[PDB]
Amino acid sequence: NNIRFETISSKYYDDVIEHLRQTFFADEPLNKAVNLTRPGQGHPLLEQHSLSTLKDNVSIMAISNDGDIAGVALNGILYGNTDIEKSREKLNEIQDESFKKIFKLLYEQNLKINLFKQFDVDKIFEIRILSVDSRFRGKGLAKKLIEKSEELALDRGFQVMKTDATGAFSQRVVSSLGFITKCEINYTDYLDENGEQIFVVDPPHEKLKIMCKVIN
C-alpha cells in the first residue's frame, strides 16, 4: 500500500487487540503447543498483558490507507530496579495450567542472563510481540516494524533492546537487524518432571532465543 507507521495510541488499543486475537495469539508457537486459545477467541491473561504493554506508549503499528492494522510491534519497558518477587509470585498465582507453563519457561530462561549488568543500563526496550496480518505479508513489514521500533527506542534514550523470540520467523528478522543470541533452548530438550516434552511445537519452530542489540 501506502502503509504508515505510527506509535499506538489508546484509540487503537481495541483494534490492536482484535488484530492479535485474529492473527497472532493462537498461532504463536508456545500458545499453539499448549492449546492456550483458539483462532479469534483471545485469552484474558494474554489480553491483560498486551494492554499493559500498550500503555508503555512505545508500540508501533503499520496501518493501511483505509485504516486497517497491517501489523504491530508491541514493545514494553523493562526496569533494572523492578523487584525480584514480582514474577515468581504471579508464577504461583496463575490458574491457567498452560499459561503457567509458558510463563515458567520464559522466567527460567531469563534467570540465566542479566542484561542490565552486562551493558550497565537501568532500563531495556523489549520487543514482546511482532505480528503481520497475512493480507499484508511480503511487503517487508515485520522488518520495518522492528526498524521503526529501534528508531523510537533511540529517540526515547534507550541503549539496549531485547526480545524473547519463541519463533523462527521473528528470530530471522531480528538477527537480520543485528540482534545477538544471549540464551537459547531447544523445545525438544525441555522436559517435565515426568520426562515428556512440555512444548511440542510445529515446524519450523525449534528454539526459544533470548536476543539483544546494543543500539547506542
Quote the CA–CA distance of 17 and 54 in Å, as a whole number: 10
The 3-state DSSP class for residue 136 equals: helix
Domain 1-216 CATH (choose: 3.40.630.30, 3.40.50.2000, 3.30.70.20, 1.20.120.450): 3.40.630.30
Residue type at position 163: T
User: How many Å from the N-terminal Cα to the C-terminal Cα in the chain?
Assistant: 32
The 3-state DSSP class for residue 5 equals: strand
Contact 53, 32 (CB under 8 A): no
Quote the CA–CA distance of 99 and 86 in Å, as a whole number: 17
Other Cβ atoms closer than 10 A to 53:
18
Residue type at position 67: G
- In which element (H, E) is residue 46 found? helix 44-54
Tell me how the structure was determined: X-ray
| Nominal resolution (angstroms) | 1.6
| Domain boundaries along the sequence of the chain | 1-216
- Please give the grid coordinates belonging to residue 53: 504493554
The 3-state DSSP class for residue 24 equals: coil
Written as one string, the DSSP assignment of 142-178 is: HHHHHHHHHHHHHHTT--EEEEEE-SHHHHHHHHHTT
Q: No. of H helices and E strands in the chain?
A: 8, 7
- In which element (H, E) is residue 3 found? none
Written as one string, the DSSP assignment of 57-108 is: S--EEEE-TTS-EEEEEEEEEEETTS-SSHHHHHHHH---HHHHHHHHHHHH
Other Cβ atoms closer than 10 A to 73:
29
Q: Where are the beta strands (DSSP E) in the chain?
A: 4-7, 60-63, 69-79, 123-132, 160-165, 180-186, 207-214
> 55 CB contacts (<8 Å, ≥6 apart)?
none
